Amino acid sequence: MKICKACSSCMVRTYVDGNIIFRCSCGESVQGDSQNLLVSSKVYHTGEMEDKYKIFIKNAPFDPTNCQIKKDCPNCHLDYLTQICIGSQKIIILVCRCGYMSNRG
Amino acid sequence: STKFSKLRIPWYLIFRMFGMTGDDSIIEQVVFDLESNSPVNTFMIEILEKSIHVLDPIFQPVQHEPNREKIIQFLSEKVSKFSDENAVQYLNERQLTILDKILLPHMGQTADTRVRKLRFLGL
Amino acid sequence: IANSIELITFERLILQWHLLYETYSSTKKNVMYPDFASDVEWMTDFLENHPLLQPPEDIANWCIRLELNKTTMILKSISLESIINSLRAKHPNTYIMHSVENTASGIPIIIRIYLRESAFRRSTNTRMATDEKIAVNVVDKLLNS
Amino acid sequence: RLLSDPAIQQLADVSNKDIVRKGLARVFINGEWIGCCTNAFELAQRYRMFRREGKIVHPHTTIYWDSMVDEVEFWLDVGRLTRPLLIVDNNIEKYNQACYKAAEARKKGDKDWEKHKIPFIQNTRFTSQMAKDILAGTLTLEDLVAQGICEFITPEEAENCLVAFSIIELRKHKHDVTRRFTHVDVPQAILGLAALV
Amino acid sequence: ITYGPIETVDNEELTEADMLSFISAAVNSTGLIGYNIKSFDDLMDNGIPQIVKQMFNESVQIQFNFTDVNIERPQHRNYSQGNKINLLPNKARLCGLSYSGPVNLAAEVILTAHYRASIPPFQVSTFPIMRGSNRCHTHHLSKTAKKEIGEDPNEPGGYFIAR
Amino acid sequence: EEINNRLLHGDIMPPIGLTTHDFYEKLQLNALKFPDRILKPIMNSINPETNGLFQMVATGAKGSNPNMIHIMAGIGQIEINTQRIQPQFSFGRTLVYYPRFALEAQAYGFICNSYIAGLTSPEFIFGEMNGRFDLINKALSTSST
Ligand SMILES: [Zn+2]
Ligand SMILES: [Zn+2]
Known part of the structure; x- marks a missing residue:
């Protein structure tokens, strides 16, 4: 997201003469640094995003409708731990109100 | 609504009309954060770029116009199918008021709430 | 026989692909994407290893960097040599480069494919089309090989 | 009431960056985004308690807390299907306190931690005397709702409810900390008059 | 409100x-058929003024506002040369007359002269009235009183009589 | 329960071309199928000579063996499109009566009761879903035909 200095508008990447030039509707063209060489990309092993369930896993201990398990909590020593089964991979994450998370959290 | 019916107005046009000036702030209204590097944020920013740069067959002349007044004029030309300085101001203010009335009426019915509406729209 | 006949497309033999918009010259150092800068090392090795295969003078300044999935290669019993040979045969306009085929854990296999102006001869092949759209089309063809 | 509430922060005060970073929770009433909150669950629970008291909040107002997204929604419009449900209370706070005390006892090495722990109990305030009063006409659903025995639930709020389909289930899991129920449902409630014929 | 400890609740029997x-208490409280009459009653009382208010309004200008609008009971007209009668649903069915009631409209009009009407309460027309609603005479009627009226006491109401 | 315990420890390794969830669902569906031995008790409680229902079923006049097993000895797993009850109620929930990500079979349409024994509320609800599906499919097929 290159932002024109004169106006806070997006610049198109011209891709001219091997150097990236950021053109704007008002002109004000800007040269492109080597950090801007990447045209596009795609990573096939997307799986399930962490932000996909970040908030849900954060709130899981306080949600009444979530499944519980009788395993003890290593941190706060509570008999019950909330169990969350997420993803087509069926990842099982054990969480607690104190903050403990079995998924390396 | 009866007015603006069957008109596929680009979103950033709507944002610019109600007061938004910079594209950075317009994208912020949708992503809530430009500094964050979460993959969701990057993918959303890419989609929003693609939507900004694409040219709508209608509203193309107005697309890049920096003046919101001119944007309100273009919209008024489209809807109308159904002193000049005071005339431009009068017509633009009236059209902006009617859009404020017909855009997210539950959010509010007065110009004071426009910014709030924008936020909601972005959400 | 069932394994042999089943279609295996290049798209499923990679983890990620990046369109870098870069040029490579055997004698002229060129700007490169930072996070992929280290790539240079293995590229040099390839140049040393294959005297016959050297960068042409027809490079179009567009680069496709591909990361291969070793697990899929082993499961499907596809060797890197076969992939390179098939890619070169199907696509003659592109210039192919690859890292060492050791497949040792911790050393991913990277393939750099540089477009040549042959792919861009008539950018307006049917109607005025930009270079980057042509590059995206070439990428799509490459993945479906 | 929500605007005056300290937890609710007006839209002008909050910033989109603050919402995204500080993990604030959006608050809606009838779909109108009124403000933000620091902890969605606490606000939802507090207003549910207020509804149970029946003074601050009318009993027929839907309070919904989404977990995938931190929004909290209050609904008071027409057309909301609603049904009474008996409330299930438990002693989870006492259970947690006893568990912490037992953990401390284990740390001390005294080995009586097993004695410190107490059984978990979940039940409903409905009793046979209440049933007799209902059949005698003394007690009505309004009286029950005025007390904490039962409350109205809508399809929106039903997403946050874990209901035992009968009192038999509640008794079966009476001492099961793994199956804390929020309500008890009389089975015949899942049928209409024509079906009940 | 503090509640008794849950450990002391004795409902094992x-x-x-x-x-x-x-279930019996719930059905008794809500009733078999409800909220149709309630919806109509909120309409009649607040919604009708609400909507008519929503419909406010060399160039002589005369807008139209409806600040005050009052509905009435059926008020059967032209019975024995009588404008007002306590129209009973049975009469509406037997005769076939619609069980509707007059609607009075009174308001003020804006006056603009760019280059206003005064209306006393008048009956533009009559509006259908649901049986069992507050406007209907059957409301607040005993079952024996329902029989005296002629309607079946067991009928729960909630249906219009028209055509 | 053994399959569920395997799931908690992550032992389930799906085969090629199947996700972990799909393999788990298939394993659960296979495990919950009734055996043929279910008919042993039924044939032990009825006298074929003087049983009207059995004589009607066996002679082909009316009914079928599954009908007898459902009336007596249990309905068993409910299947829609050769699939268990999908979580439509909410994310990870099938009905308001079960927790999110419930692991028991009963939460996904397994009926341990028979029609004579009596069905609980969730079991009745699942049966209702299945019957309405049969009716809707019949209507759609009639129209299309
Ligand atoms: Zn600019
Ligand atoms: Zn803990």
């Missing part, structure tokens, strides 16, 4: 037959 009492 509770059976599904006892739980049927809760």
Whole structure:
């Protein structure tokens, strides 16, 4: 997201003469640094995003409708731990109100 | 609504009309954060770029116009199918008021709430 | 026989692909994407290893960097040599480069494919089309090989 | 009431960056985004308690807390299907306190931690005397709702409810900390008059 | 409100037959048929003024506002040369007359002269009235009084009589 | 329960071309199928000579063996499109009566009761879903035909 200095508008990447030039509707063209060489990309092993369930896993201990398990909590020593089964991979994450998370959290 | 019916107005046009000036702030209204590097944020920013740069067959002349007044004029030309300085101001203010009335009426019915509406729209 | 006949497309033999918009010259150092800068090392090795295969003078300044999935290669019993040979045969306009085929854990296999102006001869092949759209089309063809 | 509430922060005060970073929770009433909150669950629970008291909040107002997204929604419009449900209370706070005390006892090495722990109990305030009063006409659903025995639930709020389909289930899991129920449902409630014929 | 400890609640001698009492109480409180009359009543009372208010309004200008609008009971007209009668639903069915009531409209009009009407309460027309609603005479009527009227006491109401 | 315990420890390794969830669902569906031995008790409680229902079923006049097993000895797993009850109620929930990500079979349409024994509320609800599906499919097929 290159932002024109004169106006806070997006610049198109011209891709001219091997150097990236950021053109704007008002002109004000800007040269492109080597950090801007990447045209596009795609990573096939997307799986399930962490932000996909970040908030849900954060709130899981306080949600009444979530499944519980009788395993003890290593941190706060509570008999019950909330169990969350997420993803087509069926990842099982054990969480607690104190903050403990079995998924390396 | 009866007015603006069957008109596929680009979103950033709507944002610019109600007061938004910079594209950075317009994208912020949708992503809530430009500094964050979460993959969701990057993918959303890419989609929003693609939507900004694409040219709508209608509203193309107005697309890049920096003046919101001119944007309100273009919209008024489209809807109308159904002193000049005071005339431009009068017509633009009236059209902006009617859009404020017909855009997210539950959010509010007065110009004071426009910014709030924008936020909601972005959400 | 069932394994042999089943279609295996290049798209499923990679983890990620990046369109870098870069040029490579055997004698002229060129700007490169930072996070992929280290790539240079293995590229040099390839140049040393294959005297016959050297960068042409027809490079179009567009680069496709591909990361291969070793697990899929082993499961499907596809060797890197076969992939390179098939890619070169199907696509003659592109210039192919690859890292060492050791497949040792911790050393991913990277393939750099540089477009040549042959792919861009008539950018307006049917109607005025930009270079980057042509590059995206070439990428799509490459993945479906 | 929500605007005056300290937890609710007006839209002008909050910033989109603050919402995204500080993990604030959006608050809606009838779909109108009124403000933000620091902890969605606490606000939802507090207003549910207020509804149970029946003074601050009318009993027929839907309070919904989404977990995938931190929004909290209050609904008071027409057309909301609603049904009474008996409330299930438990002693989870006492259970947690006893568990912490037992953990401390284990740390001390005294080995009586097993004695410190107490059984978990979940039940409903409905009793046979209440049933007799209902059949005698003394007690009505309004009286029950005025007390904490039962409350109205809508399809929106039903997403946050874990209901035992009968009192038999509640008794079966009476001492099961793994199956804390929020309500008890009389089975015949899942049928209409024509079906009940 | 503090509640008694849950450990002291004694309901172990509770059976599904006892739980049927809760269903009975719920049905009694809500009723078999409800909220149709309630929806109509909120319409009649607040919604009709609400909508008519929503419909406010060399160039002589005369807008139209409806600040005050009052509905009435059926008020059967031209009976024995009488404008007002306590129209009973049975009469509406037997005669076939619609069980509707007059609607009076009174308001003020804006006056603009760019280059206003005064209306006393008048009946533009009559509006259908649901049976069992507040406007209907059957409301607040005893079952014996329902029989005296002629309607079946067991009928729960909630249906219009028209055409 | 053994399959569920395997799931908690992550032992389930799906085969090629199947996700972990799909393999788990298939394993659960296979495990919950009734055996043929279910008919042993039924044939032990009825006298074929003087049983009207059995004589009607066996002679082909009316009914079928599954009908007898459902009336007596249990309905068993409910299947829609050769699939268990999908979580439509909410994310990870099938009905308001079960927790999110419930692991028991009963939460996904397994009926341990028979029609004579009596069905609980969730079991009745699942049966209702299945019957309405049969009716809707019949209507759609009639129209299309
Ligand atoms: Zn600019
Ligand atoms: Zn803990």
